[PDB]
Amino acid sequence: NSQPFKLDPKSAHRKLKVSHDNLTVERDGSYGVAGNVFIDSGRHYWEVVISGSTWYAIGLAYKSAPKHEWIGKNSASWALCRCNNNWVVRHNSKEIPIEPAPHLRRVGILLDYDNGSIAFYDALNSIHLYTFDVAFAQPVCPTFTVWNKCLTIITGLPIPDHLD
């Protein structure tokens, strides 16, 4: 098992609604919420289910990233971003295009903190999307930004064999 965590409803933008169980975040502009964990070792896998949201960003941030600055427009933030029909990854304000299978519904995030990688997957189809190589300077927390509809996180997952 990798690090189990929930959304921290205290980290959540006033324009977001975090659910009772702290696993879904909905919109009622960097509308964001963090995982309630800082990771500074090991390998960790979690997924996000996307219920038809056309504007969102899923990723990781140093503590030094200010609240709701989590869409990869600084040096402390890495994010997979849907921008309507356009999917990019963003770190340090660099927008790097990716080409997912249409109707990307379930996204895998594999953080290898020790070896210094953030890998994004189409978890449903077992397609690698992009890997960030990082020499992590600080602990990182998962981050979720959503502009419409909702996201659901699944955490504490084994590192799957159905990916590579």
Author numbering: 482 to 509, 526 to 661
What does the paper say about this structure?
The tripartite motif (TRIM) proteins form one of the largest subfamilies of RING-type E3 ubiquitin ligases, comprising more than 80 members. TRIM family members typically contain a RING domain usually catalyzing ubiquitin transfer; one or two B-box domains mediating protein–protein interactions; and a large coiled-coil domain region, which is involved in self-association or oligomerization with other TRIM E3-ligase proteins. About two-thirds of human TRIM proteins feature a PRYSPRY domain, also known as the B30.2 domain, in their C-terminal region. All characterized family members shared the same overall PRYSPRY twisted β-sandwich fold consisting of a 7-stranded and a 6-stranded antiparallel β-sheet.
A characteristic feature of the putative substrate-binding site in the closely related homologs MID1 and MID2 is an arginine located at the C-terminus of β-strand 7 (R587 in MID1 and R637 in MID2) that projects its guanidinium group toward the center of the cavity and two neighboring tryptophan residues lining the pocket. MID1 is mutated in X-linked Opitz G/BBB syndrome, a rare genetic disorder that results in malformations along the midline of the body, including hypertelorism, hypospadias, and laryngo-tracheo-esophageal defects. Many of the reported mutations map to the PRYSPRY domain. Some of these, such as I536T and I555V, are large-to-small substitutions that potentially create internal cavities in the hydrophobic core of the β-sandwich, thereby reducing the thermodynamic stability of the domain. Like p53, the MID1 PRYSPRY domain is only moderately stable (DSF Tm of 47 °C), so it is also susceptible to global unfolding by cavity-creating mutations. The L626P mutation also perturbs the hydrophobic core of the β-sandwich and, being located in the middle of β-strand 11, also disrupts interstrand hydrogen bonds. The small-to-large mutation G532R introduces severe steric clashes and would bury a positive charge within a cluster of hydrophobic side chains, including Phe486 and Trp543. Therefore, this mutation is also likely to severely compromise the folding of the domain. The D611G mutation, for example, is located on the short loop connecting β-strands 9 and 10. This mutation results in the loss of a stabilizing hydrogen bond between the carboxylate group of Asp611 and the backbone nitrogen of Gly539 in the β3/β4 turn.
